[PDB]
Structures are given as structure tokens and as C-alpha cells.
């Protein structure tokens, strides 16, 4: 839909109803994943390279606090090496990170947003 409507305000209106918090959602931005090499930067693959101490930009938010609500700001630009990684989340509720752990997503909430809605209803 459009912008400024109350678009993420609906998420925090239910982040406190069922998850009891205002600090329950963890939003990310998919306006950086337009290059084929920075795709694994959200999860951080090997033991031994640049991203190992920092950890996964998606996984290090759910390894602790396993009850969040994720928001994908502007999904509709990213490269389609994200979409299979997004699909395997809702294939089985697991995602193997860079360390080697197996992180459960089977009681979280996904929200994908986009800013179309200019002319056509």
C-alpha cells in the first residue's frame, strides 16, 4: 500500500497484544541485497572469514528472543537469491546459520511490505 498510512503501526499494535512487548519486532531492510555477493551477508557463511564475529544479520536476532515479528522493508527490489532463502523458512521452520546451529522459526510472524498503490486500487 501507500506510505505513512499506519503500515508498520499495525505490526506494533499486535507486537504488544500477543508478544507483550514494544521491543518485540526486529525489522530489516532489503534495499541492499541487489548484488549477488552480498546475499549471504544476512546469514554469514564460513568459519574463518570477515563475517563470523558479527554473525548473521537475520539469525543473530532470533537465536535469542525466539518470539519476534520480522518486517521486510521494500522486498520488491532484492535479487532472487533471497526468495529461495525466504521460501525455505516456510518449508520447514529451520535455518542453519554460519556457526552450525539450527534456528527454529515455527512460532514467529513474517510481514512483507511494498510501496505500490499509487494509481490502481
Amino acid at each position: 500500500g501507500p506510505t505513512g498510512v499506519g503500515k508498520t503501526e499495525l505490526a506494533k499494535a499486535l507486537a504488544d497484544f500477543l508478544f507483550d512487548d514494544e521491543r518485540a519486532m526486529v525489522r530489516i531492510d532489503m534495499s541492499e541485497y541487489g548484488e549477488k555477493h552480498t546475499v549471504a551477508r544476512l546469514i554469514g557463511a564460513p568459519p574463518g572469514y570477515v563475517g563470523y564475529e558479527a554473525g548473521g544479520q537475520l539469525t543473530e536476532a532470533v537465536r535469542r528472543r525466539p518470539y519476534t515479528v520480522v518486517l521486510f522493508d521494500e522486498i520488491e527490489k532484492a535479487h532472487p537469491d533471497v526468495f529461495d532463502v525466504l521460501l525455505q523458512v516456510l518449508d520447514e521452520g529451520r535455518l542453519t546459520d554460519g556457526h552450525g546451529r539450527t534456528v527454529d522459526f515455527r512460532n514467529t510472524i513474517l510481514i512483507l511490505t511494498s510501496n505500490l498503490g499509487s494509481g490502481g486500487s
Binding site: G48, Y49, V50, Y52
Partner: peptide
């Protein structure tokens, strides 16, 4: 009529060290 004879002492506390853990940068 005894004395006091203030005795001495010895102290010790060691040090640490750090390791650097290079990153292969690719």
C-alpha cells in the same frame, strides 16, 4: 616483657595475554 618483631610478607598477581585471530578476508 616480650617484644613484637614485625614480620615481612610477599605478594603475587600474574598477568594475562591476548590473541589476535586474523581473518582471511575474501
Amino acid at each position: 616483657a616480650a617484644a613484637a618483631a614485625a614480620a615481612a610478607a610477599a605478594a603475587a598477581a600474574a598477568a594475562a595475554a591476548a590473541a589476535a585471530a586474523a581473518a582471511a578476508a575474501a
